[PDB]
């Protein structure tokens, strides 16, 4: 097989049933891959943890607009 | 195991089809978590790539054995 598909592919296989207020996240990753059973999205926080979301809530895409806007090196 | 299924699970879909030359080798993690399709192991190299491998291999056991003895598994 090719050696791209022995890439691990990371999921989410639940999606958080509440809203994180943006001030606790720091930035986020989308999951596309179609391994996976869902699109989603991971949310890092501040306090350097991963959660994952759900692209279709409002209070998630209202959330990665403010994200793109900053960035931490 | 992670706390909640709403933290990511990094999974191995496929598994490389020949060893990986141990010399590359850093590091691995076993892959255990019920939402997998199979247990699994990932080998991260010395150029960070990660690499997905079936732990009934022997050279799959045999790398993971000699990271644990050199190394202890870890890169601090």
Redesign the interface.
């Given at each position: 097989?090719p050696?791209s598909?022995?890439?691990?592919?990371?999921?989410?296989?639940?999606?958080?049933?509440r809203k994180i207020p943006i001030q606790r996240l720091e930035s986020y990753t989308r999951?596309t891959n179609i391994?996976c059973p869902k699109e989603?999205v991971?949310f890092k926080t501040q306090r350097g943890?991963?959660?994952?979301a759900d692209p279709k809530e409002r209070w998630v895409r209202d959330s990665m607009k403010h994200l793109d806007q900053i960035f931490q090196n």
């Open positions: 097989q050696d598909v022995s890439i691990p592919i990371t999921c989410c296989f639940n999606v958080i049933n999951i391994q989603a991971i943890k991963e959660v994952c």
